[PDB]
């Protein structure tokens, strides 16, 4: 309103961001109306700053962080109850669109799930309190019936007799909710109604007369049960809700649970037995099949399967903290004995197929899993169900997991499965065709023939196609009406949308919808338009809602806010049409960057836009529909699937583009046959562009120079063309944009390509080629940071080197080291006006690399990398001197002297950087004593005060200058994307987010067991959180924080841009900040405990647990012979560790859903790193350095320090790749390796041969930074960098170069015999895990590796 | 345009794709549905007859490659159901489209449907049709 | 009857997926002509022989496979079926090439290795000739 100007001023006394912080607080608001006005506002603020939240979401690879809180605070609103927030929040979600899974970060705001506070027993006070909300809950809403609220009323009388208090437990109660007691206090109140015994009727009660109600039910068999237990307290408190039973039947859903738990307590066995029959009753009844009254006895088989689900849950963990309770007599013992026969009566399978019958997949694959392992079912009987099961959770790494386990053949309808999971359309029609020749009769098939035939674009043929199953089964015409609806708009024939529309309204299918949308839209009908909008929108809400409890909820309904973004696009693209003055804010070219890269988000998105650019006739509004065909084409061509690309590429040829044939190229590039692209490509070049005419203008500028860049890529593999002709080529691109990062990154990369063969690999000759080179490499740098991590690392590896040269030949004295030395002077010349023109983020990556060569022999390089790295420190000095002290603290003399330079000119260029630097110092110094300092004797706690007093003391000064904790968010940088940000960089922030400082420590200081004992403190941020920190005292972390940056690189690669993100891959990274080349601090990764303790505590339950002298009756020497160690392995090792790990999962996550969402997890993330490791040599991964999240189950790997198959190098040999024993195996699941890991194995290995070249680029300066000691460090008595040099280089430094690009390309080199190496392609996967599964390499291993464990 | 409609008709499939390779200007799409099918292919090639169809859907030259592409992959089930959607939309046009049913029909050995489709169609020489005769005779 | 299997693997290995073409090849040679009773036919012999000599060449492509246990598949093709010029041709290939890496380039080590592959090749040209062209001039 008007007047909130004081208002306003008085709340800032006090107190676009801003007002979306408080927009966000609105939301979280409890009340319903303030969040209907809070979304509103907040809705009209996304459209009308749309332009300013678009930089906020492209700005960058990672949105800011606000519009990640903003995305799960309204994924909590598709929670809300109310259906008017939820709808204004599928409105809310579509304003701000459906961003990249991956440009979000959940990682903060995914951190809720406390879950726990278990309700073991009535008589503790955790049910005394919920028994109390249910005596209130709806008592607010049996004030209309007497006896209802009498009812509740006496049952507050018997609750409060024994849980009165006059004063902890009073106090628990709510003021309000003990208010409503109040006139109930401990007056006497008369029973509220009879008693009728509920044994009299016959059972089981579920089947006759009265289980056919889903209430009655309920309250029959509750009181009945009240009948059968002998616990008197327990009788009482069950007697006093029975009159309570009979009004509500969440008193039974809150109660029956305990209600079972102390039948099982004290019961008969026939009683027992009887209850379980009911049970089995409930379960084996499936509403379809039994022919009675319906509408009450469906809806009463869903209800009572929830319901036992709910109690057999309860009783599951009833019994797991029984177990704890043994573990912490007899009665206890008895109880315990009791509830495992009574869970072990009902069979898991039959839990399984309930469950699935009452759509809770989740809780059907966790039974399923258990059963198989428990009851030791073949697998290949069960199997089907198990395709059925991941076919419907939509899990295509389960489908094609269980095809790799099926003996037997396919049968035709999972072959259909097959096809449909993992969508290869050319073939799955001709799956669905034969399938009809088998069986025309049914119906589903021709589903599919109509979807495939939709999904390749052959609209045409499909409502054709749908109208001869029309003919032949006009029953089937409705509900294959959708399909002809579908392509009917996606061909804009709004008149035969009208017939199919008129034609049929009982069809809801979202296809239907859209179609219901578009015609109101063509023929103006503006009310019943926005309508049916808000009636879509509602509906995809509902499934929306579903998917958004927060367990990675974003992606798994990203397909759903697809559609939201959608609707929105709709929408604001037809009020303009309803106006007509008003057009529309939305920026279609940027709404369309932050989709997801893959198809089946994108396209979708394409087609409304047609359909739109279909409705909307603008003059232009005839090649924008092209150039949307064209865009469809691109991401097609991206996402594999060809033949839909060149089907929209025909779609757009009638606009006039040039680009049409960039795109033409491209997709037969895709293809493979350079040759055949490369021709249509020079042909298309010339009818576009001739070369009489100069294209120097507008667009087409544009489209020239990526034509020509295109050829002069193609170029390069064909290798006819010579090369000054794609030097040619390259150049005239330059030439033509300038400005551009593609152009000069793409020569440079040529000019490298071809530097060491035109100079024989002689440096001295190539002195004026390494100045090109990284002229255009800094050049591209400038205008772009698509692939700063390919040209950075690149360029500065190129410069040093070739100083490091040039510093050599002039201790050789040679001849050409003058004209060299001048040459070198022009190269450093170059980075200098580099170092000039960029921005100082870019340096910040790879600043790691830069620090590796401040021991650079030569003086001059060394000034003009002194001029770099004081740039990044003066922008960014707390990111900087963290990197930094450690080579402030080192050993080496030399790299001492030039930390003071560098850190002396820093100073020398700014002074408040004096005082941060002498504080840190001062802070590491102090951190690095802590380090240092020998356990007291063997506590495994300290106090800092009384031992680090001054450590303590030092942040406790207020002029101590604030130091950021060094967290892995905080290290790494953030890119800005291609578009965008960078057309006004430099101003970029690399660092969006809350910057923690360190405040204060917690005095205690606890001390892991190690051969040198580890150090944990912890940090009190400014912020008021406290996070971990853990001194590794004898490693040398430089290896570890640099190949830890590496991982956060690969992050970067995977958390974007991929179908790996589906998966949400996602490499564990967790900061490692050397403080000196001794000692270390490693970012703690809360919630976590090693393998092989999570194991041992595992058979200590079991009780099973092989002896120390028994490991020392397995070692055997190395001599001995392979066959019979293998052997010794088998008989003792392997019965002796039977696979438990999935009794772990089951323990630490009980939620059926979230030990799902969670073993899912572990797969994907022990697949993912276990690659990462493969393909970086990742050694010494013993059962301890592997440890997993006790909150979602990935595993954190730890203890880098063996690298590059450096585990070949000990004295015994490390076999096998990764860690993968037969006990993760089980974790896996019953499918095992074939499951959801092999899949996520393959995905992970093809992006690292697709994102080789950075990868590759980044580890070569990684495998030459010379700071690492590669090789153990030389005594004080002669420095191991003689002081001089200051560096060590690594011998076998070329050798692991090759080796890993080897492993990158898929050549295995394994047979020294077999030397044709046909280079693999996922079958690489399957020799990686065949070779980790092996016993014979398994058994091998030193039993400090565990392999039995 | 006229070399290529030549070569087309001589059955020259080299010819067709000379024409092709040198051709400067883009080809229309009726030349790269000649094209396609010198070429043999069978996917992009339903994919420009759909296109066509889209374009000029009072052809019967376009639905006739596009059924003739679908008996082809081997749908045949297919084949025979968009021969009567087509059939339904225009009934004279199925007399033309008939020697692919026949010949899906007796493919799929739905000898009532050969049968039926025969007493349908009239007198055709395609060597579908006179198999189909010859075929539901034998039955 | 392990034929649609060995031609399934066919169509793969011509597809370019080799690896998928390997496992089916191997799922197959599992499920039909399984190793705990030989197949007594003859055509199921003749069939069983060619899944082993396409299971031998899908090896030979892949790089994963010990030269020992391809040189064994091989040998098993010759036993199962020893009266079909592939089989013998194709083993007489594999030690062909096996020959310079096994005697290291050195003819006189080369000697016994030269034996057996002659041996092969004209076993190989005995029953057939599909490959005189390229087993003769060997
Ligand atoms: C989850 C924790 C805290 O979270 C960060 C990662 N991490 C650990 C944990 C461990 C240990 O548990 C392994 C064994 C058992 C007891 C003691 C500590 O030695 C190590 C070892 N090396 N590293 C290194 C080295 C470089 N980076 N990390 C460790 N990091």
Known sequence: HPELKKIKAVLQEYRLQTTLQLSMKAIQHENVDVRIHALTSLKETLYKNQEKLIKYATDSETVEPIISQLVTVLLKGCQDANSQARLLCGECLGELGAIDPGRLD???????????????????????????????????????????????????????????????????????????????????????????????????????????????????????????????????????????????????????????????????????????????????????????????????????????????????????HKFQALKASTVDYEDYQSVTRFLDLIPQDTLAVASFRSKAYTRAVMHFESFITEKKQNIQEHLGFLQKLYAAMHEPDGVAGVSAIRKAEPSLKEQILEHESLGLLRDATACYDRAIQLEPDQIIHYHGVVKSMLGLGQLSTVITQVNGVHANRSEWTDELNTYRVEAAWKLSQWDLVENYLAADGKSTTWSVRLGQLLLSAKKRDITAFYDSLKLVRAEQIVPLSAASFERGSYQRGYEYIVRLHMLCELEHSIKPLFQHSQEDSLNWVARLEMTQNSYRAKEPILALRRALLSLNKRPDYNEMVGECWLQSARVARKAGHHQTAYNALLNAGESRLAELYVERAKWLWSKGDVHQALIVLQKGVELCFPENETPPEGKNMLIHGRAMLLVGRFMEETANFESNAIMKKYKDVTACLPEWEDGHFYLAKYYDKLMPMVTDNKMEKQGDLIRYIVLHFGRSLQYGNQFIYQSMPRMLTLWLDYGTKAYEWEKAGRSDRVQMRNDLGKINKVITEHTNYLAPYQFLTAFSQLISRICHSHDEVFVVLMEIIAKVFLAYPQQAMWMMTAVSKSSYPMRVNRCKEILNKAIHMKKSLEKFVGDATRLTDKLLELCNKPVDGSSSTLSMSTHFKMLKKLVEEATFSEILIPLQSVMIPTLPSILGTHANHASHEPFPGHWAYIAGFDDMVEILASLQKPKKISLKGSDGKFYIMMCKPKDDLRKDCRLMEFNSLINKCLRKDAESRRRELHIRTYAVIPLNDECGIIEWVNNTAGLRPILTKLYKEKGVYMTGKELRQCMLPKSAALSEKLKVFREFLLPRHPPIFHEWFLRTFPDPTSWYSSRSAYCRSTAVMSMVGYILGLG????????????????????????????????????????????????????????????????????????????????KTFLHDPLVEWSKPVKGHSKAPLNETGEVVNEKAKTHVLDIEQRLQGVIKTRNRVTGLPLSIEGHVHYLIQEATDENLLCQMYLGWTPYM
């Open 1180 to 1259: 010494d991964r013993h059962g301890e350095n592997i440890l997993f999240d006790s909150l979602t189950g990935e595993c954190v790997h730890v203890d880098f320090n063996c690298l590059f198959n450096k585990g070949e190098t000990f004295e015994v040999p490390e076999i096998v790749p990764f860690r993968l024993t037969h006990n993760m195996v089980n974790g896996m699941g019953p499918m095992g390796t074939e499951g959801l890991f092999r899949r996520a194995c393959e995905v992970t290995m093809r992006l690292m041969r697709d994102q080789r070249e950075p990868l590759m680029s980044v580890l």
């Open 106 to 320: 959940f990682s903060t705001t995914e951190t809720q799930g406390k879950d726990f506070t278990f309700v073991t027993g009535v008589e503790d006070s955790s049910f005394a309190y919920g028994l109390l909300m249910e005596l209130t809950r709806a008592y607010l809403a049996y004030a209309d019936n007497s006896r209802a609220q009498d009812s509740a009323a006496y049952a507050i009388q018997e609750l409060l007799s024994i849980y009165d208090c006059r004063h902890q437990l009073w106090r628990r109660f709510p003021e309000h909710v003990r208010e409503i007691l109040e006139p109930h206090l401990n007056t006497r109140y008369k029973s509220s109604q009879k008693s009728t015994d509920w044994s009299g009727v016959k059972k089981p009660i579920y089947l006759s007369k009265l289980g056919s109600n889903f209430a009655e039910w309920s309250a029959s068999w509750a009181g009945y049960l009240i009948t059968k237990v002998r616990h008197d307290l327990a009788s009482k408190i069950f007697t006093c809700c029975s009159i309570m039973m009979k009004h509500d039947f969440k008193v039974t859903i809150y109660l029956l649970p305990h209600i079972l738990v102390y039948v099982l307590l004290g019961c008969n066995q026939e009683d027992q037995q009887e209850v379980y029959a009911e049970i089995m009753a409930v379960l084996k009844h499936d509403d379809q099949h039994t022919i009675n009254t319906q509408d009450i006895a469906s809806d009463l088989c869903q209800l009572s399967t929830q319901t036992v689900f709910s109690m057999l849950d309860h009783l599951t963990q009833w019994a797991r």
